[PDB]
Design an enzyme around this catalytic site. Structure first.
Site, short mmCIF file in Angstrom:
data_model
loop_
_atom_site.label_atom_id
_atom_site.label_comp_id
_atom_site.label_asym_id
_atom_site.label_seq_id
_atom_site.Cartn_x
_atom_site.Cartn_y
_atom_site.Cartn_z
N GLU A 11 0.85 -1.24 0.09
CA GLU A 11 -0.07 -0.07 0.00
C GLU A 11 1.03 1.22 0.11
O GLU A 11 0.22 2.25 -0.43
CB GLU A 11 -1.14 0.20 1.27
CG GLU A 11 -2.15 -1.12 1.10
CD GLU A 11 -2.94 -1.11 -0.07
OE1 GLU A 11 -3.35 -0.21 -0.33
OE2 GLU A 11 -2.88 -2.09 -0.52
N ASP A 20 -6.17 6.29 -4.61
CA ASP A 20 -6.02 4.89 -4.88
C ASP A 20 -6.01 4.27 -6.33
O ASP A 20 -6.21 4.93 -7.28
CB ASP A 20 -6.86 3.86 -3.85
CG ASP A 20 -7.88 3.61 -4.18
OD1 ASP A 20 -8.60 4.05 -5.45
OD2 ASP A 20 -8.85 3.27 -3.40
#
Length: 164
Positions: A11, A20
């Protein structure tokens, strides 16, 4: 290696609101804020998450606090889900980490791909499970991330994360 280091690799860490892989406002270590296209809505969620009026910017300590909460929430979600719990219970600790990742604030595609692997995973048919997940929509979207997680399910080792 462990679930925290694993997800930190997958991440990253960003202290300012970013989008994202699906284009959704996110912060810290993959903390999804909202699916709304409104940056103001994202900022509102951030302030509520952190408990203070932010400037779309948080500290590393704050990012890690959210991260720990999110890892907790993922484990909680697994244990409360009738389909996920027995598979999770059946797994060794390394493969459990892979499961935590798949349900770690993913799109629908991540849930679907992992859900289709649940059967083969419980049977410990590792290569078959890997193939089943590889052919998912999740893998299509993030071959690199999915490949690491699938290798973890296939081998029960951290080999996919050791160079990282």
């Amino acid at each position: 290696m462990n679930i925290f280091e694993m997800l930190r690799i997958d991440e990253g860490l960003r202290l300012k609101i970013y989008k994202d892989t699906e284009g959704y406002y996110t912060i810290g270590i993959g903390h999804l804020l909202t699916k709304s296209p409104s940056l103001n809505a994202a900022k509102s969620e951030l302030d509520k998450a952190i408990g203070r009026n932010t400037n779309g910017v948080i500290t590393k300590d704050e990012a890690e606090k959210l991260f720990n909460q999110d890892v907790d929430a993922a484990v909680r979600g697994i244990l409360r889900n009738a389909k996920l719990k027995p598979v999770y219970d059946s797994l060794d600790a390394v493969r459990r980490a892979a499961a935590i990742n798949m349900v770690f604030q993913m799109g629908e595609t991540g849930v679907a791909g992992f859900t289709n692997s649940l059967r083969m995973l419980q049977q410990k048919r590792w290569d078959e499970a890997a193939v089943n997940l590889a052919k998912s929509r999740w893998y299509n979207q993030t071959p690199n991330r999915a490949k690491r997680v699938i290798t973890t399910f296939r081998t029960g080792t951290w080999d996919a994360y050791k160079n990282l």
